[PDB]
Nucleic acid binder design. Sequence first.
DNA 1: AGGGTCTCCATTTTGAAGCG
DNA 2: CGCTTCAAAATGGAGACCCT
Length: 114
Amino acid sequence: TIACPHKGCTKMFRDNSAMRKHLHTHGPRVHVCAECGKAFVESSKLKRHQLVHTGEKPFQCTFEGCGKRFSLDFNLRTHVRIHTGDRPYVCPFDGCNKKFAQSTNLKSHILTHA
DNA sequence: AGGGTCTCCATTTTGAAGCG
DNA sequence: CGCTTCAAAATGGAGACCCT
Ligand SMILES: [Zn+2]
Ligand SMILES: [Zn+2]
Ligand SMILES: [Zn+2]
Ligand SMILES: [Zn+2]
């Protein structure tokens, strides 16, 4: 197993090919948004970051009455679930039955338990 | 192959309602 | 005004996907 070179990086890899790709993430952040300065290692991310600027919401809710738009594919899926009702984050407390559909929504709930 | 891309997830970060 | 709540915006890493 190849351990990631990168000074403080704890990570380990099967093939040094996976290690090298990975290593890429600590690299110089060459891709700098001309609008505000944020920089990204890849260009894909800088492109995507642009949606912070335009406001473009490409993905839309084909639910009757909804039609809400989101800028990101994944973010849309996470909301349509408020239609499906899929609350996939079941609380852990023995005998507390609250479910959630966001691991932020659920774990801070846990905080309440304490 | 193997390098840029992109799809996709998990996560983090931000905001708006509810409500006490 | 305090939260907890629920909902959205955004980021970062893995690794699949697509070349030539
Ligand atoms: Zn590393
Ligand atoms: Zn920017
Ligand atoms: Zn919807
Ligand atoms: Zn609980």
